[PDB]
Design a protein around this motif. Sequence first.
Motif, PDB file in Angstrom:
ATOM      1  N   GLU A  59       0.779  -1.385   0.234  1.00  0.00           N
ATOM      2  CA  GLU A  59       0.231  -0.161   0.086  1.00  0.00           C
ATOM      3  C   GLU A  59       0.958   1.308  -0.169  1.00  0.00           C
ATOM      4  N   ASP A  60       1.975   1.453   0.488  1.00  0.00           N
ATOM      5  CA  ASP A  60       2.623   2.395   0.874  1.00  0.00           C
ATOM      6  C   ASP A  60       3.403   2.576  -0.234  1.00  0.00           C
ATOM      7  N   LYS A  61       3.890   1.701  -1.273  1.00  0.00           N
ATOM      8  CA  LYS A  61       4.381   1.685  -2.539  1.00  0.00           C
ATOM      9  C   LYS A  61       3.440   2.568  -3.545  1.00  0.00           C
ATOM     10  N   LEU A  62       2.649   2.060  -3.239  1.00  0.00           N
ATOM     11  CA  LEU A  62       1.630   2.846  -4.024  1.00  0.00           C
ATOM     12  C   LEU A  62       0.587   3.724  -3.863  1.00  0.00           C
ATOM     13  N   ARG A  63       0.710   4.383  -2.671  1.00  0.00           N
ATOM     14  CA  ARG A  63       0.565   5.481  -2.074  1.00  0.00           C
ATOM     15  C   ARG A  63       1.638   6.643  -2.899  1.00  0.00           C
ATOM     16  N   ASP A  64       2.950   6.146  -2.698  1.00  0.00           N
ATOM     17  CA  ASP A  64       4.102   6.910  -3.693  1.00  0.00           C
ATOM     18  C   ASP A  64       3.914   6.940  -5.267  1.00  0.00           C
ATOM     19  N   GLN A  65       3.044   6.275  -6.051  1.00  0.00           N
ATOM     20  CA  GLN A  65       2.768   6.536  -7.539  1.00  0.00           C
ATOM     21  C   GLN A  65       1.446   6.952  -7.627  1.00  0.00           C
TER      22      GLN A  65
END
Length: 115
Positions: free
Chosen positions: A23-29
């Motif tokens: 989820e955090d990597k997704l947030r950074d997109q």
Amino acid sequence: LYFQDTARKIIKTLLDIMREGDEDKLRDQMDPNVRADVGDKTVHGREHAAKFLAHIVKRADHISITLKSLHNHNGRLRMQAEVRIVHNGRTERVTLEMVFRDHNGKLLIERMKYG
């Protein structure tokens, strides 16, 4: 996209991040002002957008991305891509509108539509 590459790398990175499901990597997109139209409701901002996308990809059997449109102008590559998430034979579709800027090398998802 000069011949005499970037779209492909973008898509493959996005596939890697969705397959991992972090989820955090997704947030950074996500663009800070991303808009996600999830069925009846609309949510805004990186955290809500990432929570929606992480939920949908964490349950998948297979994930693919189809490039639907691209516009390449003045160092900006705008892309519309359809993510297909099959679960138990059933396909959920999420359409992404995203922009990559050559100067900083950053991809940002500006809009998502569930579906």
